[PDB]
């Protein structure tokens, strides 16, 4: 199923609100075309590593431990969902 | 083979890929797997318990075309088993060796 224009779903306040959690007061208007780029790099290195686990067990559902196993691979461990 | 030359064992080997050459052992393995099969019906196969049974249950099965025990053809008289012959107790053991 194909639904495009959804890198533009990461809206303009929801990058500002993520900026405020990092402790950032004033931002530019050109981070919005940088953040959407660095985000899709990070999801093209997790979903590419997650699907090769789900294809390997011949599952059609990328389950909760799969993503945690992908994040185990990169060296960014996620607790709380298992694994 | 180096142990076998100590005892005086003449080792004999079958022709390869020919299990028919070893005659009786391929028959009694169809006996042991028809005694241990029959004992172990309807329970977990704990067959290490039943091995002193098998070399006393098969060794007192009459050969039905020879009409003797394996005990009698090996020793000469039955041991204290159920249903043992008294037909040899009418004889002298000092003379039934050559019988």
């Amino acid at each position: 199923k194909v639904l495009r224009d959804n890198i533009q779903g990461i809206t303009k306040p929801a990058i500002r609100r993520l900026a405020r959690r990092g402790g950032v007061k004033r931002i530019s208007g050109l981070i919005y075309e940088e953040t959407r780029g660095v985000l899709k790099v990070f999801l093209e290195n997790v979903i590419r590593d997650a699907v090769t686990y789900t294809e390997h067990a011949k599952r059609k559902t990328v389950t909760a431990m799969d993503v945690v196993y992908a994040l185990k691979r990169q060296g960014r461990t996620l607790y709380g969902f298992g694994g | 083979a180096e142990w076998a030359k100590e005892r005086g064992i003449h080792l004999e080997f079958s022709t390869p890929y020919h299990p028919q050459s070893s005659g009786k052992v391929e028959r009694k393995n169809s006996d042991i797997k028809r005694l241990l099969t029959k004992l172990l019906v309807g329970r977990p196969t704990k067959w290490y318990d039943l091995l002193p049974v098998v070399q006393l249950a098969l060794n007192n099965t009459y050969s039905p075309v020879l009409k003797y025990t394996p005990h009698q053809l090996l020793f000469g008289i039955d041991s204290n088993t159920p249903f043992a012959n008294q037909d040899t107790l009418d004889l002298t053991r000092e003379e039934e060796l050559s019988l």
Binding site: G75, L78, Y79, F81 | -
Partner: protein, 110 residues
């Protein structure tokens, strides 16, 4: 017939984390072929010291913000408050936590 009183090996060492369950997770995880009898004892203790040290610190932050139960924000905040606990989990995201309160003291208003 009966047998003796089965005393668990977690009660024979004064721990709380099991040693029977740890000793079958060193022979079904292919870590090595032989696993000593004292190794899952010694490992269930180190799993028990470090489970206290978070929850000791997670108890305080629950108390300092007037809470009965420890929600993950406290686990988020008990970690990264302690220095040496943070250097263990320096790469590790905790789910549903957010970050510590932090301003770089240059963004303060004028």
């Amino acid at each position: 017939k009966a047998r003796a009183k089965a005393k668990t090996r977690s009660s024979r060492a004064g721990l709380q984390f099991p040693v029977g369950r740890v000793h079958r997770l060193l022979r079904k995880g292919n870590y090595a072929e032989r696993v000593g009898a004292g190794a899952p004892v010694y490992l269930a203790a180190v799993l028990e010291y470090l489970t206290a040290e978070i929850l000791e610190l997670a108890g305080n932050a629950a108390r300092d913000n007037k809470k009965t139960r420890i929600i993950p924000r406290h686990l988020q905040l008990a970690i990264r408050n302690d220095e040496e606990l943070n250097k263990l989990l320096g790469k590790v995201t905790i789910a549903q936590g957010g970050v510590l309160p932090n301003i770089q003291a240059v963004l303060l208003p004028k």
